[PDB]
């Protein structure tokens, strides 16, 4: 209902993102070709998403301002920062898909896989990163929050990259790494790699855009948004395998990439010594017979219905945290976020 | 003499960089392994350089402060920001070497080529990027310049990436791109891709650290530092081919990568229609017989002595710009920089 509303409005505003970010032509005719390529990047990589995070910034902003203070220019900034989160996202997936060897994403071939692109993808990725802060200076350079956002976006990139380093240290190509797959490792991973940016960031951004910068208020918010954070990825890793690729818009590479997924983690808790051995022979390998034998094993331990279980268990716990912790904020923020991620 | 002095002092201070950047252990035991890997990155990629830029920040700072204001903590910040530029550098080369397919750099194998690393190099690279701003908040969070530096480092990353996009758009693997190799393109390239960060940045950083933030003072400085900027890369591209690999610490990939180098540019101005054709058949290809036939052609048009010519021509012009433009600043800044890059 509530994201469903302002989505289209959120997406039209992407025409101006691109306009502004590439309005340097007669001033710098030399670099016009870099700026075209830039456009081409943004069109391809910032678009197709569920735009949930970018939206989340916008919805949160409305919710947290007295509409007597939501003037035209405040909403200008409101969805600008929205778009910045989308860029951040886009930055991450473009790099992520080289690193994770992915084939497709958002219903089309990965940027880095297009012929004529390949590893220029890396430079492209960091460009999106840059555009984030380019906008900030544009639309927020004179706000009292301008600096808090910059630090937020960065403090959040770092955290994402720390997560990403764990992801990979825990998931070497070649090395049977079942010992490494503990739930203690896992919670750490999705915390840094997912929760902070896909949740704390967007919300937090708007908190600062609403003049709300108390450490304790941010801390509570954080407490809540790291769970939603966390479930979200267990759902990502679930969908990776049992999800519909015409609906996820991507193909899963978790078994092949020897990844510390929720699944392999639970699988291990419930392994008969023999089973441990089947998985051992099969996990972390390109071969489809092996990837298949594992998918069977996950089904052989009825993990999909276990995921259905945690989904309820977590919905219920996330909801307790909202009650315990939302205030002084309007609980519609978090609720709106939960509706949009639970099934 | 002057860089030769504070180099060793500059390099000892790298023990504390690593200490500080990895002093989160008992506070966050979960992520200790990411932070080890981080250490490993920094050790490998921030070290071995000529540390010229990092130094340049430090030397410039002394030169531009009354030593009654150069207290212990000002020099703490002074070389911290030094190190930040080194990180920025390191960020760029780690990504650069994947993108440019380089084999070696700084007298050893490229990070991304080590076995067990490969494309995790990409995540590693952005980590260095992050550390920059991690330090800033650490040692400069309470300074009046703190924000100007952040914007400088970013405004400079973007510019570097724009350059880098030109680099690559101008240099597709496969496509004979001799038409594209004009000196108008070239000046644009090395301007964004090299001059801004290896020169304007370090100096400018210290200008702001010395409380000097007038647009016109920065503008003049910029005018001067973009030439030094520019020559520096023509020397890089010269050395790429005719340089000593036990002294550059790297092997050149400009012909192989179909790059818009100073050389191919000059080569083209002086081409007999036939010659244009030899180069045509040979440029932009892995094959060593072809790379060889080109190196011959550059020697066949006595370009090395032409480089010796521009070197003098540019030394002389750079020096005119210092006279025309240094003030109110101490001309020893720029001079010190020129001594250290001219032969
Ligand atoms: C450098 C870098 C650092 C972190 C990422 C992240 C990817 C990602 C993400 N993507 C998912 P996917 O896009 O479903 O593959 P992952 O399982 O690869 O992590 N989902 C939630 N958080 C993150 S953070 C991507 C690139
Ligand atoms: C993403 C990115 C963007 C820019 C770079 C740059 C590499 C580089 C550089 N490296 C030299 P090299 O390190 O001698 O190969 P290049 O000819 O590849 O540009 N020298 C001067 N400026 C720059 S900027 C590297 C990575
Ligand atoms: Mg992935
Ligand atoms: Mg991943
Ligand atoms: Mg995933
Ligand atoms: Mg290179
Ligand atoms: Mg290059
Ligand atoms: Mg070069």
XYZ file of C-alpha atoms and ligand atoms in Angstrom:
744
model
C 0.000 0.000 0.000
C 2.512 2.642 1.268
C 5.622 1.795 -0.807
C 3.248 0.809 -3.634
C 2.127 4.457 -3.649
C 5.323 6.487 -3.972
C 7.280 3.953 -6.048
C 6.315 5.376 -9.423
C 6.854 8.902 -8.090
C 10.276 7.663 -6.757
C 11.231 6.292 -10.194
C 10.287 9.282 -12.338
C 12.775 11.252 -10.223
C 15.528 9.100 -11.693
C 15.176 11.180 -15.012
C 16.557 14.226 -13.076
C 19.223 12.164 -11.286
C 20.754 11.357 -14.664
C 20.074 14.889 -16.015
C 21.938 16.595 -13.108
C 24.783 14.074 -12.915
C 25.507 14.628 -16.615
C 24.868 18.413 -16.928
C 28.537 19.403 -17.455
C 28.741 19.273 -21.293
C 29.557 22.777 -22.687
C 31.582 23.483 -19.515
C 33.847 20.443 -20.076
C 33.487 19.192 -23.704
C 36.667 17.069 -23.341
C 35.151 14.509 -20.983
C 31.783 14.151 -22.665
C 32.447 10.563 -23.574
C 33.199 9.531 -19.993
C 29.943 11.176 -18.996
C 28.045 9.288 -21.696
C 29.459 5.992 -20.425
C 28.507 7.171 -16.956
C 24.906 7.631 -18.147
C 25.031 4.198 -19.697
C 26.176 2.719 -16.376
C 23.409 4.345 -14.366
C 20.699 3.389 -16.806
C 21.836 -0.250 -16.674
C 22.644 -0.733 -12.998
C 20.571 1.688 -10.936
C 17.322 0.489 -12.547
C 15.425 -2.792 -12.386
C 15.762 -3.066 -8.626
C 12.775 -3.250 -6.256
C 14.008 0.242 -5.281
C 13.126 -0.694 -1.691
C 15.936 1.033 0.079
C 15.636 4.247 -1.980
C 11.969 4.216 -1.314
C 12.584 3.432 2.406
C 14.453 6.735 2.739
C 11.505 8.623 1.210
C 8.718 6.964 3.180
C 10.702 7.321 6.417
C 11.203 11.047 5.697
C 7.464 11.739 5.317
C 6.715 9.706 8.477
C 9.276 11.672 10.513
C 8.573 15.302 9.484
C 5.619 17.611 10.324
C 4.207 18.234 6.759
C 4.422 21.975 7.458
C 8.200 21.260 7.068
C 7.860 18.916 4.005
C 8.173 21.714 1.416
C 9.082 21.141 -2.285
C 12.830 21.361 -1.675
C 12.743 18.994 1.336
C 11.240 16.319 -0.887
C 13.835 17.292 -3.471
C 16.464 16.261 -0.942
C 14.238 13.449 0.361
C 14.357 11.323 -2.801
C 17.815 12.533 -3.754
C 19.183 10.712 -0.739
C 16.791 7.885 -1.689
C 18.655 7.629 -5.040
C 22.049 7.800 -3.293
C 21.157 4.575 -1.427
C 20.227 2.969 -4.774
C 23.635 4.039 -6.111
C 25.352 2.464 -3.066
C 23.392 -0.652 -3.715
C 24.409 -0.547 -7.418
C 27.981 0.093 -6.575
C 27.925 -3.138 -4.436
C 26.216 -5.478 -6.911
C 28.386 -4.441 -9.848
C 31.551 -5.317 -7.934
C 29.745 -8.152 -6.209
C 28.922 -9.918 -9.465
C 32.532 -9.954 -10.653
C 33.757 -11.272 -7.316
C 30.884 -13.796 -7.059
C 31.066 -14.865 -10.773
C 27.330 -14.245 -11.251
C 25.770 -14.582 -14.710
C 22.568 -12.565 -14.353
C 20.925 -10.047 -12.071
C 17.668 -8.040 -12.263
C 16.450 -10.128 -15.221
C 19.402 -9.414 -17.447
C 23.020 -10.306 -17.951
C 25.455 -8.752 -15.482
C 27.074 -5.516 -16.493
C 30.566 -7.069 -16.256
C 29.487 -9.912 -18.558
C 28.342 -7.704 -21.434
C 30.833 -7.912 -24.272
C 32.938 -4.785 -24.464
C 32.716 -4.201 -20.713
C 34.345 -7.031 -18.775
C 36.536 -5.584 -16.029
C 35.967 -1.948 -16.803
C 33.049 -2.922 -14.548
C 35.383 -2.250 -11.657
C 35.881 1.436 -12.654
C 32.203 1.681 -13.463
C 31.318 0.437 -9.973
C 33.363 3.038 -8.155
C 31.750 5.741 -10.335
C 28.304 5.039 -8.924
C 30.010 5.123 -5.524
C 31.279 8.649 -6.345
C 27.912 9.899 -7.699
C 26.482 9.366 -4.217
C 28.607 12.068 -2.732
C 28.368 14.210 -5.892
C 24.629 14.500 -5.270
C 25.009 15.079 -1.569
C 27.101 18.202 -2.205
C 24.603 19.227 -4.849
C 21.333 18.984 -2.961
C 22.454 18.945 0.738
C 25.665 21.048 0.846
C 23.976 23.745 2.961
C 22.047 21.511 5.412
C 23.063 20.961 9.086
C 22.894 17.212 8.382
C 25.144 17.221 5.250
C 28.173 15.921 7.161
C 26.286 13.304 9.175
C 25.074 11.708 5.969
C 28.496 11.685 4.416
C 29.862 9.877 7.490
C 26.851 7.576 7.559
C 27.284 6.503 3.875
C 30.999 5.896 4.400
C 30.760 4.319 7.870
C 28.273 2.096 6.134
C 30.453 1.290 3.116
C 33.299 0.211 5.346
C 30.972 -2.046 7.412
C 29.642 -3.581 4.166
C 33.183 -4.238 3.032
C 34.177 -5.788 6.308
C 31.207 -8.083 5.897
C 32.239 -8.769 2.354
C 35.785 -9.669 3.476
C 34.251 -12.127 5.972
C 31.992 -13.509 3.233
C 35.115 -14.363 1.199
C 37.634 -15.396 3.879
C 34.949 -17.822 4.980
C 34.412 -18.955 1.362
C 37.625 -19.814 -0.530
C 37.324 -21.395 -4.000
C 38.827 -24.906 -3.672
C 39.030 -25.218 0.102
C 36.455 -27.429 1.796
C 35.455 -25.039 4.540
C 32.668 -26.792 6.479
C 34.417 -26.313 9.817
C 34.161 -22.543 9.158
C 30.377 -22.582 8.691
C 29.194 -21.783 12.208
C 26.146 -19.680 13.084
C 28.463 -17.379 15.062
C 30.395 -16.546 11.884
C 27.158 -16.205 9.957
C 25.441 -13.662 12.201
C 28.648 -11.587 12.061
C 28.681 -11.814 8.284
C 25.158 -10.675 7.398
C 25.439 -8.027 10.069
C 28.235 -6.121 8.430
C 27.601 -7.163 4.897
C 23.816 -6.564 4.771
C 22.049 -5.279 7.771
C 23.823 -1.966 8.172
C 23.359 -0.714 4.628
C 19.998 -2.238 3.548
C 18.229 -0.951 6.730
C 20.133 1.049 9.221
C 21.413 3.395 6.573
C 18.205 4.321 4.829
C 16.216 4.885 7.985
C 19.116 6.545 9.754
C 19.621 8.860 6.769
C 16.113 10.154 7.097
C 16.480 10.408 10.913
C 19.264 12.905 10.306
C 17.236 14.553 7.541
C 14.503 14.982 10.146
C 16.968 16.580 12.583
C 17.169 13.446 14.788
C 20.755 12.673 15.707
C 20.694 11.473 19.334
C 23.023 8.499 19.821
C 20.399 6.604 21.932
C 17.572 7.098 19.402
C 19.898 5.905 16.615
C 21.046 3.033 18.855
C 17.544 1.747 19.453
C 16.646 2.066 15.719
C 19.886 0.215 15.004
C 18.809 -2.603 17.465
C 15.567 -3.106 15.556
C 16.955 -2.595 11.994
C 19.797 -5.164 12.398
C 17.297 -7.984 12.836
C 15.319 -7.010 9.732
C 18.809 -6.588 8.467
C 19.562 -10.225 9.383
C 16.360 -12.050 8.398
C 16.499 -10.307 5.005
C 19.730 -12.087 4.122
C 18.522 -15.523 5.393
C 15.699 -14.990 2.940
C 18.265 -13.980 0.247
C 20.232 -17.225 0.826
C 17.009 -19.237 0.952
C 15.815 -17.732 -2.330
C 19.280 -18.210 -3.862
C 18.375 -21.923 -4.154
C 14.614 -22.393 -3.739
C 13.628 -19.054 -5.246
C 12.051 -18.318 -8.602
C 14.618 -16.806 -11.049
C 11.923 -14.954 -13.047
C 11.095 -13.241 -9.733
C 14.530 -12.900 -8.034
C 15.892 -11.814 -11.457
C 19.141 -13.708 -10.712
C 20.722 -17.151 -10.474
C 22.334 -18.499 -7.289
C 26.025 -19.271 -6.958
C 26.223 -20.097 -3.191
C 26.996 -23.794 -3.440
C 29.364 -23.317 -6.400
C 31.165 -20.511 -4.529
C 31.563 -22.556 -1.320
C 29.526 -19.872 0.525
C 28.567 -19.717 4.177
C 24.831 -19.693 3.494
C 22.079 -20.046 6.118
C 21.332 -23.331 4.479
C 24.674 -25.107 4.700
C 24.755 -23.821 8.274
C 21.486 -25.457 9.279
C 22.242 -28.501 7.135
C 25.391 -29.037 9.283
C 23.563 -28.878 12.621
C 21.324 -31.740 11.411
C 23.963 -33.886 9.670
C 24.379 -37.604 10.226
C 28.121 -38.267 10.014
C 27.544 -39.831 6.565
C 25.565 -36.814 5.347
C 28.360 -34.521 6.459
C 30.424 -36.599 3.998
C 28.000 -36.302 1.050
C 27.931 -32.549 1.399
C 31.686 -32.645 1.873
C 32.207 -34.239 -1.562
C 29.715 -31.895 -3.243
C 29.771 -28.384 -1.754
C 31.906 -25.580 -3.237
C 32.091 -26.909 -6.815
C 30.929 -25.791 -10.308
C 29.774 -29.297 -11.259
C 25.949 -29.491 -11.543
C 25.662 -33.149 -10.429
C 27.266 -31.995 -7.159
C 25.215 -28.804 -6.769
C 22.165 -31.056 -7.444
C 23.129 -33.715 -4.855
C 23.323 -30.894 -2.260
C 19.948 -29.326 -3.173
C 18.605 -32.849 -2.630
C 20.261 -33.031 0.795
C 18.688 -29.730 1.845
C 15.333 -31.168 0.744
C 16.277 -34.459 2.450
C 16.483 -32.517 5.745
C 13.226 -30.589 5.125
C 15.032 -27.219 5.472
C 12.506 -25.291 3.339
C 9.872 -25.914 6.046
C 12.504 -24.964 8.635
C 12.897 -21.632 6.766
C 9.119 -21.242 6.891
C 9.602 -21.819 10.642
C 12.262 -19.126 11.269
C 10.201 -16.764 9.103
C 7.382 -16.935 11.682
C 9.804 -17.076 14.659
C 11.533 -13.888 13.294
C 8.458 -11.986 12.298
C 7.379 -12.499 15.915
C 10.712 -11.442 17.413
C 11.181 -8.454 15.104
C 7.736 -7.361 16.238
C 8.728 -7.584 19.922
C 11.703 -5.329 19.220
C 9.446 -2.744 17.572
C 7.254 -2.701 20.751
C 10.241 -2.687 23.094
C 12.171 -0.100 21.050
C 10.435 2.023 18.323
C 9.573 5.056 20.441
C 9.774 7.940 20.574
C 9.478 7.253 16.818
C 6.270 6.400 14.918
C 6.059 2.579 14.758
C 4.672 2.804 11.166
C 8.259 3.180 9.932
C 9.343 -0.259 10.996
C 5.975 -1.820 10.325
C 5.961 -0.590 6.746
C 9.429 -2.068 6.325
C 8.315 -5.462 7.735
C 5.198 -5.787 5.513
C 7.410 -5.156 2.484
C 9.934 -7.936 3.325
C 7.815 -10.744 4.870
C 6.432 -12.859 1.997
C 67.704 16.621 0.119
C 64.274 17.698 1.525
C 62.136 14.608 0.769
C 65.271 12.510 1.380
C 65.168 13.823 4.962
C 61.656 13.072 6.204
C 61.110 9.891 4.170
C 62.314 7.497 6.848
C 60.414 9.487 9.480
C 57.344 9.300 7.123
C 57.664 5.502 6.844
C 58.082 4.644 10.519
C 54.695 6.321 11.026
C 53.158 3.543 8.953
C 53.578 1.186 12.072
C 50.916 3.333 13.870
C 48.698 3.579 10.774
C 48.297 -0.195 10.859
C 48.124 -0.268 14.696
C 45.217 2.255 14.830
C 43.336 0.866 11.826
C 43.327 -2.584 13.444
C 42.803 -1.657 17.145
C 39.226 -3.019 17.403
C 39.941 -6.616 18.563
C 38.406 -7.204 22.053
C 35.603 -4.757 21.148
C 34.590 -6.791 18.061
C 36.129 -10.319 18.253
C 33.777 -11.551 15.478
C 35.447 -9.614 12.673
C 39.045 -10.189 13.685
C 39.759 -12.185 10.579
C 38.583 -9.433 8.234
C 40.849 -7.066 10.121
C 43.798 -9.438 9.759
C 43.239 -9.604 5.999
C 42.967 -5.830 6.091
C 46.414 -5.665 7.731
C 47.722 -8.035 5.108
C 46.381 -5.763 2.358
C 47.974 -2.631 3.769
C 51.323 -4.262 4.348
C 51.382 -5.471 0.731
C 49.961 -2.504 -1.158
C 50.653 0.672 0.803
C 54.388 -0.101 0.996
C 57.128 -0.239 -1.622
C 56.058 3.009 -3.244
C 58.338 6.054 -3.558
C 55.889 7.491 -0.989
C 56.189 10.788 -2.882
C 52.658 11.984 -2.550
C 52.392 11.062 1.156
C 55.636 12.808 1.723
C 54.477 15.796 -0.413
C 51.644 16.399 2.062
C 54.118 16.433 4.973
C 56.765 18.656 3.409
C 54.095 21.081 2.171
C 52.629 21.265 5.703
C 55.949 22.274 7.305
C 56.565 24.844 4.532
C 53.129 26.424 5.045
C 52.873 26.678 8.866
C 54.688 28.986 11.345
C 56.598 26.345 13.460
C 55.072 27.916 16.579
C 51.898 26.188 15.212
C 53.633 22.875 14.209
C 53.051 21.167 17.581
C 53.224 17.356 18.132
C 49.559 16.799 17.278
C 49.703 18.936 14.102
C 52.426 16.664 12.769
C 50.309 13.758 13.964
C 47.636 14.965 11.560
C 50.277 16.096 9.049
C 51.544 12.608 8.176
C 48.188 10.982 8.829
C 46.818 12.814 5.823
C 50.123 11.940 4.112
C 49.237 8.234 4.615
C 45.658 8.811 3.406
C 47.070 9.927 0.023
C 49.184 6.738 -0.077
C 46.005 4.740 0.593
C 44.228 6.556 -2.279
C 47.157 5.744 -4.454
C 47.019 2.079 -3.310
C 43.333 1.901 -3.821
C 43.914 3.003 -7.491
C 46.780 0.656 -8.385
C 45.114 -2.422 -6.915
C 42.036 -1.902 -9.085
C 44.202 -0.524 -11.857
C 46.246 -3.706 -12.159
C 43.193 -5.928 -12.594
C 41.724 -3.623 -15.221
C 45.107 -3.165 -16.964
C 46.109 -6.893 -16.698
C 49.470 -5.994 -15.128
C 51.792 -8.749 -13.892
C 54.037 -6.881 -11.456
C 54.252 -3.614 -9.580
C 56.673 -2.233 -6.952
C 59.116 -5.107 -7.561
C 56.668 -7.868 -6.806
C 53.722 -9.698 -8.258
C 50.434 -7.793 -8.242
C 48.155 -8.355 -5.308
C 45.365 -9.646 -7.591
C 47.768 -12.168 -9.145
C 48.780 -13.840 -5.884
C 47.184 -17.261 -5.655
C 44.307 -17.258 -3.212
C 43.485 -13.613 -3.924
C 42.432 -13.114 -7.537
C 39.340 -10.910 -7.658
C 38.902 -10.464 -3.950
C 41.392 -7.757 -4.958
C 38.378 -5.672 -5.868
C 36.990 -5.751 -2.277
C 40.489 -5.271 -0.948
C 40.910 -2.147 -3.086
C 37.800 -0.434 -1.803
C 38.934 -1.193 1.775
C 42.016 0.983 1.424
C 39.650 3.571 -0.055
C 37.561 3.369 3.156
C 40.582 3.523 5.519
C 41.285 7.001 4.154
C 38.145 8.413 5.626
C 38.406 6.181 8.721
C 41.625 7.995 9.613
C 40.262 11.404 8.778
C 37.497 11.006 11.373
C 40.076 9.652 13.781
C 42.745 12.330 13.644
C 40.891 15.341 12.080
C 37.246 14.997 13.237
C 37.485 18.175 15.346
C 39.413 20.415 12.899
C 37.821 23.298 10.902
C 39.308 21.705 7.766
C 37.934 18.149 8.348
C 35.115 18.596 5.823
C 37.222 20.321 3.168
C 39.561 17.351 3.092
C 36.760 14.859 2.837
C 35.373 16.749 -0.178
C 38.856 17.138 -1.622
C 39.621 13.359 -1.426
C 36.265 12.512 -2.996
C 36.198 15.327 -5.576
C 39.578 13.928 -6.444
C 38.498 10.280 -6.628
C 35.708 11.133 -9.020
C 38.096 13.139 -11.266
C 40.533 10.187 -11.247
C 37.727 7.870 -12.250
C 36.558 10.129 -15.016
C 40.109 10.070 -16.298
C 40.167 6.334 -15.934
C 36.925 6.007 -17.938
C 38.548 8.104 -20.694
C 41.680 5.944 -20.501
C 39.524 2.885 -21.280
C 36.919 4.263 -23.712
C 39.908 5.456 -25.698
C 41.572 2.024 -25.363
C 39.300 -0.935 -26.216
C 40.853 -4.426 -26.392
C 40.491 -5.538 -30.043
C 39.553 -2.245 -31.675
C 42.240 -0.487 -33.695
C 41.798 2.966 -32.238
C 44.482 5.136 -33.877
C 41.968 7.758 -34.985
C 41.173 8.247 -31.265
C 44.781 8.995 -30.288
C 44.832 12.784 -30.507
C 46.791 15.098 -28.207
C 43.488 16.792 -27.314
C 42.159 13.515 -25.892
C 45.473 12.862 -24.189
C 45.757 16.125 -22.260
C 42.180 15.550 -21.042
C 43.070 12.037 -19.953
C 46.164 12.636 -17.818
C 44.475 15.691 -16.389
C 41.668 13.833 -14.715
C 43.373 10.533 -14.304
C 46.707 11.762 -12.864
C 47.261 15.393 -12.330
C 44.497 16.090 -9.847
C 45.332 13.341 -7.381
C 49.152 13.000 -7.640
C 49.666 16.797 -7.167
C 46.724 19.007 -6.632
C 45.405 16.821 -3.869
C 48.467 16.483 -1.702
C 49.416 20.133 -1.829
C 45.823 21.283 -1.579
C 45.304 19.024 1.447
C 48.063 20.767 3.302
C 46.787 24.197 2.135
C 43.573 23.442 3.994
C 45.550 21.997 6.905
C 47.352 25.341 7.013
C 44.029 27.218 7.075
C 44.328 28.326 3.413
C 41.055 27.835 1.584
C 40.671 30.839 -0.746
C 39.342 29.757 -4.148
C 41.882 31.995 -6.013
C 44.905 30.705 -4.055
C 43.759 27.119 -4.704
C 43.094 28.033 -8.352
C 46.594 29.329 -8.942
C 48.162 26.293 -7.162
C 45.912 24.131 -9.331
C 47.233 25.957 -12.505
C 50.813 25.097 -11.577
C 50.172 21.553 -10.194
C 48.263 20.345 -13.314
C 51.354 20.771 -15.472
C 53.572 18.822 -13.070
C 50.504 16.690 -13.034
C 50.741 16.316 -16.834
C 54.488 15.932 -17.437
C 54.577 13.263 -14.710
C 52.351 10.970 -16.754
C 54.255 11.587 -20.052
C 57.245 10.377 -18.085
C 55.167 7.391 -16.813
C 54.237 6.434 -20.413
C 57.812 7.019 -21.565
C 59.181 4.804 -18.793
C 56.478 2.197 -19.480
C 58.539 1.219 -22.559
C 62.064 2.649 -22.285
C 62.269 2.477 -18.500
C 64.248 0.109 -16.317
C 61.956 -2.519 -14.673
C 64.313 -3.001 -11.691
C 63.797 0.737 -11.086
C 60.138 1.302 -12.134
C 59.311 -1.953 -10.270
C 56.737 -2.798 -12.983
C 56.302 -3.997 -16.558
C 54.520 -1.959 -19.248
C 51.281 -3.019 -20.896
C 50.509 0.131 -22.992
C 51.009 -1.327 -26.449
C 49.340 -4.638 -25.526
C 46.380 -2.745 -24.020
C 45.931 -0.493 -27.079
C 46.556 2.545 -24.811
C 46.571 6.214 -25.714
C 50.165 6.767 -24.616
C 52.224 9.924 -25.223
C 54.310 7.785 -27.484
C 51.731 6.466 -29.930
C 50.451 10.042 -30.009
C 53.754 11.543 -31.112
C 54.490 8.538 -33.317
C 51.269 9.366 -35.254
C 52.155 13.023 -35.849
C 55.389 11.855 -37.536
C 54.017 8.868 -39.485
C 54.670 8.249 -43.159
C 51.472 6.708 -44.532
C 53.269 3.326 -44.637
C 54.426 3.644 -41.023
C 50.880 4.396 -39.945
C 50.178 0.951 -41.455
C 52.986 -0.897 -39.622
C 51.797 0.447 -36.307
C 48.255 -0.322 -37.403
C 49.045 -4.042 -37.787
C 50.990 -4.166 -34.511
C 49.505 -1.887 -31.838
C 46.991 -3.156 -29.251
C 48.040 -6.830 -29.270
C 49.549 -9.350 -26.785
C 51.925 -10.794 -29.393
C 55.579 -9.909 -28.611
C 56.738 -9.782 -32.264
C 54.161 -6.996 -32.701
C 54.968 -5.144 -29.467
C 58.639 -5.409 -30.600
C 57.999 -4.062 -34.132
C 56.354 -1.003 -32.500
C 59.183 -0.360 -29.998
C 61.402 -0.388 -33.094
C 59.162 2.166 -34.813
C 59.343 4.499 -31.813
C 63.138 4.160 -31.989
C 62.912 4.539 -35.789
C 61.374 7.997 -35.202
C 63.915 8.967 -32.499
C 61.117 9.621 -29.953
C 63.324 8.983 -26.893
C 65.341 12.107 -27.802
C 62.033 13.897 -28.421
C 61.048 12.963 -24.828
C 64.384 14.363 -23.666
C 63.276 17.476 -25.594
C 59.838 17.936 -23.954
C 61.487 17.239 -20.591
C 63.563 20.426 -21.002
C 60.702 22.343 -22.702
C 58.417 21.411 -19.715
C 60.883 21.975 -16.947
C 61.226 25.471 -18.419
C 57.482 26.077 -18.722
C 56.634 24.625 -15.308
C 59.216 27.029 -13.929
C 57.542 30.016 -15.625
C 54.249 29.049 -13.997
C 55.894 28.945 -10.565
C 57.189 32.540 -11.129
C 53.901 33.745 -12.597
C 51.771 31.970 -9.967
C 53.321 30.597 -6.703
C 52.692 33.608 -4.474
C 51.575 34.439 -1.938
C 52.907 30.924 -1.202
C 56.562 29.968 -0.602
C 57.987 28.865 -3.983
C 60.004 26.086 -2.226
C 56.855 23.940 -2.265
C 56.691 23.651 -6.010
C 60.438 23.674 -6.443
C 60.871 20.746 -4.085
C 58.228 18.882 -6.067
C 60.001 19.608 -9.396
C 63.478 18.471 -8.225
C 61.920 15.187 -7.102
C 60.272 14.420 -10.494
C 62.758 15.739 -13.108
C 65.342 12.988 -13.734
C 32.349 -4.796 -2.246
C 31.094 -5.326 -1.919
C 30.736 -5.452 -0.580
C 29.487 -5.978 -0.208
C 28.550 -6.405 -1.163
C 27.337 -6.881 -0.778
C 26.452 -7.675 -1.432
C 25.296 -7.930 -0.742
C 24.203 -8.669 -1.062
N 24.173 -9.335 -2.215
C 23.833 -10.784 -2.191
P 23.282 -11.378 -3.849
O 23.219 -10.016 -4.694
O 21.901 -11.936 -3.746
O 24.351 -12.234 -4.399
P 25.299 -11.811 -1.585
O 24.789 -13.106 -1.071
O 26.367 -11.796 -2.610
O 25.843 -10.934 -0.383
N 23.146 -8.809 -0.245
C 23.138 -8.164 0.982
N 24.257 -7.400 1.320
C 25.291 -7.307 0.456
S 26.702 -6.497 0.582
C 28.918 -6.264 -2.510
C 30.169 -5.739 -2.888
C 39.858 3.171 -10.751
C 41.108 3.721 -11.065
C 41.177 5.019 -11.561
C 42.410 5.607 -11.888
C 43.623 4.916 -11.737
C 44.805 5.519 -12.030
C 46.017 4.987 -12.330
C 47.009 5.910 -12.540
C 48.320 5.762 -12.857
N 48.816 4.542 -13.060
C 49.577 4.283 -14.312
P 50.645 2.785 -14.158
O 50.466 2.399 -12.611
O 52.070 3.162 -14.392
O 50.050 1.720 -14.989
P 48.409 4.102 -15.787
O 49.170 4.383 -17.029
O 47.649 2.837 -15.660
O 47.362 5.262 -15.525
N 49.155 6.800 -13.029
C 48.686 8.093 -12.863
N 47.338 8.256 -12.534
C 46.549 7.170 -12.384
S 44.965 7.060 -12.007
C 43.543 3.611 -11.227
C 42.309 3.016 -10.899
Mg 26.360 -12.071 -4.876
Mg 28.209 -12.095 -2.111
Mg 22.909 -13.825 -1.774
Mg 48.252 0.700 -15.128
Mg 45.931 2.636 -16.518
Mg 51.287 4.138 -17.019
